[PDB]
Amino acid sequence: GSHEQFRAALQLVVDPGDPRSYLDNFIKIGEGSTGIVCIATVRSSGKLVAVKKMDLRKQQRRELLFNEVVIMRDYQHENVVEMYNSYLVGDELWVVMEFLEGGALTDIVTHTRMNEEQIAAVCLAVLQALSVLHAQGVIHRDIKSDSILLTHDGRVKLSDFGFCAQVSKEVPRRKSLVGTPYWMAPELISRLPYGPEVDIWSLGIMVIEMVDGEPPYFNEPPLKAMKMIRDNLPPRLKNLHKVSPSLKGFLDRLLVRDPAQRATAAELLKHPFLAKAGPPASIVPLMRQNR
Numbered sequence: 001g002s003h004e005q006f007r008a009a010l011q012l013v014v015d016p017g018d019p020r021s022y023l024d025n026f027i028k029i030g031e032g033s034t035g036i037v038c039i040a041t042v043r044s045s046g047k048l049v050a051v052k053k054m055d056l057r058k059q060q061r062r063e064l065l066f067n068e069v070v071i072m073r074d075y076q077h078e079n080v081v082e083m084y085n086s087y088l089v090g091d092e093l094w095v096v097m098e099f100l101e102g103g104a105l106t107d108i109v110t111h112t113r114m115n116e117e118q119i120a121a122v123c124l125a126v127l128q129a130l131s132v133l134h135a136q137g138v139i140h141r142d143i144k145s146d147s148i149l150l151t152h153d154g155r156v157k158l159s160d161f162g163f164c165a166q167v168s169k170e171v172p173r174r175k176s177l178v179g180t181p182y183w184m185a186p187e188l189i190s191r192l193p194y195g196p197e198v199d200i201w202s203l204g205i206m207v208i209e210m211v212d213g214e215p216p217y218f219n220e221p222p223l224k225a226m227k228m229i230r231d232n233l234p235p236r237l238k239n240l241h242k243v244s245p246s247l248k249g250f251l252d253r254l255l256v257r258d259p260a261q262r263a264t265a266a267e268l269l270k271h272p273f274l275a276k277a278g279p280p281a282s283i284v285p286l287m288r289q290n291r
């Protein structure tokens with residue numbers, strides 16, 4: 001009864017019909033927790049799209065799917081991966097979305113060194129997106145390099161809202177333990193009521209990735225690392241010598257243990273460091289098929 005109850009709930013928010021009628025040439029490009037992600041062609045237009053397929057009978061939290069679809073059901077931002085449609089195909093949920101030909105940022109931080117112009121460009125894009133997302137009570141809860149996709153001309157788009165949540169004037173905070181261990185904020189790990197600020201911290205951790213090539217305590221087990229993040233002071237850049245005072249000053253506004261003292265997206269947009277940010281063309285040489 002439980003599973004069949006969820007299907008019925010989906011059918012009230014997903015578009016009716018079988019998308020297999022107009023989609024062709026599926027090619028897998030990703031996998032992991034939720035399900036598999038493929039790209040496919042639309043037969044009517046010849047356009048390329050990306051299709052995320054999530055089996056309902058394989059989710060640790062089946063309700064997190066509903067959240068994602070009803071909350072992003074055609075939200076529209078220049079710096080967010082646009083959703084086109086959602087479908088219920090058998091026991092699977094299909095989310096049809098924009099195809100980002102540039103790939104994920106993870107590929108860039110593990111193979112090259114980004115300069116501060118390129119780091120500031122990424123940050124600027126993420127902040128502009130988060131400022132609006134937070135302004136409407138939406139928390140990503142999984143900001144990291146995997147959640148940052150690129151275009152061919154190097155335009156940054158925030159992706160993977162599989163963990164996102166909605167807060168309101170009535171319910172201004174969340175409680176559930178959600179995200180990736182290494183990028184988690186301390187107030188979130190310590191099992192405390194948290195707000196949108198948990199993304200600013202994770203953004204901070206992602207900045208470390210762009211400099212060190214990996215987040216703090218990445219050598220440790222997930223559980224042990226979380227305990228370290230919980231008890232310890234803010235983490236230190238292994239390549240502190242490589243970063244400018246401007247960046248270091250910027251980063252110090254992100255990795256503040258007290259969520260109240262930690263900066264917000266709207267504030268950070270006015271930081272002098274973001275003036276270093278360059279055009280989307282500057283990201284281009286970093287991409288795999290250019291380097």
Ligand SMILES: COCCNc1nc2ccc(C#CC3(O)CCCCC3)cc2n1-c1ccnc(N)n1
Nearest residue numbers: 029030037050081083099100103104159160161162
């Ligand atoms: C670079 O390729 C890595 C694997 N591809 C991939 N995995 C994804 C997981 C979740 C979402 C996702 C998601 C959303 O949460 C974003 C907001 C709208 C609803 C779906 C998107 C993923 N992608 C995509 C998608 C498009 N292009 C490319 N290159 N990779």
